[PDB]
A paper describes a structure:
CD38 is a 46-kDa membrane glycoprotein with a short 20-aa N-terminal sequence, a single transmembrane segment and a 256-aa catalytic carboxyl domain. Decades of research documents that it is a novel multifunctional molecule, serving not only as a differentiation antigen on cell surface, but also, most surprisingly, as the dominant signaling enzyme responsible for the metabolism of two intracellular calcium messenger molecules, cyclic ADP-ribose (cADPR) and nicotinic acid adenine dinucleotide phosphate (NAADP) (reviewed in Lee1). It is well-established that the C-terminal domain possesses all the catalytic activities of the enzyme. In this study, we have generated a series of nanobodies targeting three different epitopes on CD38, definitively identified by crystallography.
The purified recombinant protein was used as an antigen to immunize llamas. Phage display technology was used to obtain 19 positive clones against CD38. The crystal structures of seven different nanobodies complexed with CD38 were solved. Three separate epitopes are identified and are colored differently (orange, cyan or green). Two of them (orange and green) are located close to C-terminal region of CD38. An additional epitopic region (cyan) is distinct, which is located close to the middle of the molecule. Consistent with the long distance between the epitopes and the catalytic pocket, none of these nanobodies shows any antagonistic effect on the enzymatic activity of CD38 (data are not shown). CD38 and nanobodies were mixed at equal molar ratio and diluted to 20 mg/ml. The diffraction data were collected at 100 K at BL17U at the Shanghai Synchrotron Radiation Facility and processed with HKL200047.
Residue numbers in the entry:
A (entry chain B): 3 to 73, 78 to 120
B (entry chain A): 49 to 245, 250 to 300
The structure:
């Protein structure tokens, strides 16, 4: 249902682009988002996108990250520029809707910024 | 006299009008002759004892109401009819049983005849429990439900009522007829949407029962929580409202 890719290791200042394919009707109907979890921390929502492509970003990534979507599958992409060590985490894509659960989770994709 | 309510007032005119209206709202079914549909419907139960109705009695009607729905766009439901219908009013490529011609004609109606006259019984009709199970209404819903479930393919979705004592009820129409007529291979997955009335209700014992039933038919099971069903409907209609998106 959720498959993430595009992670890896990059130097501070560099760029990565993450991809997620979400399979299911509820993904097609819901706002989606990218989340991340640093090793000993709470999973945080960092970027959201409506079905039609209206975006919102956490202040800590505003101006550096771009979320896009192509639409029963939705693909959700996270372009990450000028990466900082603080961005080191496992990244996950899921629904970001008050109406529908982020029930299950993919394996995520690991990003390491040195 | 029976234990159940009598036939719906103006039943003949109601069926005829519903048939005409259906063929107006759904132009793809304008080839049907609504007078012929009514004649076939009536033929299934008139001049017959209403505890001896068979699926065969409804065959002429089933043939006349034949409707090929896109098999991958079927929404089943159990104990939450109103929300499922509201969903297909906004997600118009999907169909519940009562969005098909035959389901639309009969929804919320009651009917029966009697063995010794050609009269419709407006006084009372058999109750499934108290009187008899093979009554005109119950046999109609068993027949059409079986056929609708048989025609589904790919991923089939079902809305279940999360506020009930049994979220999945094996004795419901969904649990006793629909689920047992989903065909393996044809149907890859049954995905349940549990409608809340904020725990994960996909761990409910009755959901685990449904999963077992489905897996025994060699079909995959998926379960989701719809935490806010009215908001869900709003966002299906217009996903661009900011209340459709979780706060950062």
């Amino acid at each position: 249902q959720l498959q993430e890719s595009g992670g890896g290791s990059v130097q501070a200042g560099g760029s990565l682009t993450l991809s997620c394919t979400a399979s299911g009707l509820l993904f097609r109907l819901a706002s989606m988002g990218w989340y991340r979890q640093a090793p000993g921390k709470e999973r945080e929502l960092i970027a959201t996108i409506t079905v039609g492509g209206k975006t919102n970003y956490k202040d800590s990534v505003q101006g550096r990250f771009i979320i896009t979507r192509d639409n029963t599958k939705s693909t959700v992409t996270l372009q990450m520029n000028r990466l900082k060590p603080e961005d080191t985490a496992v990244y996950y894509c899921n629904t970001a809707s008050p109406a529908v659960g982020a029930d299950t989770w993919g394996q995520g994709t690991r990003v390491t910024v040195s | 006299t029976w234990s159940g309510p009598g036939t719906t007032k103006r039943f003949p005119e109601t069926v005829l009008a519903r048939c005409v209206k259906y063929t107006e709202i759904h132009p793809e079914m304008r080839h049907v002759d609504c007078q012929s549909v009514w004649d076939a419907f009536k033929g299934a139960f008139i001049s017959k004892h209403p505890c001896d109705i068979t699926e065969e009695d409804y065959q002429p009607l089933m043939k006349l109401g034949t409707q090929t729905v896109p098999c991958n766009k079927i929404l089943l439901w159990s104990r939450i009819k109103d929300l499922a219908h509201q969903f297909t009013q906004v997600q118009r490529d999907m169909f519940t049983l009562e969005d098909t011609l035959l389901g639309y004609l009969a929804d919320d109606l009651t009917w029966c005849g009697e063995f010794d006259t050609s009269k419709i019984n407006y006084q009372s009709c058999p109750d499934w429990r108290k009187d008899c199970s093979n009554n005109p209404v119950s046999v109609f819903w068993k027949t059409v439900s079986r056929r609708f479930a048989e025609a589904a393919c790919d991923v089939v979705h079902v809305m279940l009522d999360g506020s009930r004592s049994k979220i999945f009820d094996k004795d419901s129409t969904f649990g006793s007829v629909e689920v047992h007529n989903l065909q393996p291979e044809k149907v890859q997955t049954l995905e349940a949407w549990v409608i809340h009335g904020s725990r994960d209700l996909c761990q409910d014992p009755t959901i685990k029962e449904l999963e077992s039933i489905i897996s025994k038919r060699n079909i995959q099971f998926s379960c989701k929580n719809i935490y806010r069903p009215d908001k869900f409907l709003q966002c299906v209609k217009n996903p661009e409202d900011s209340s459709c998106t979780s706060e950062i």
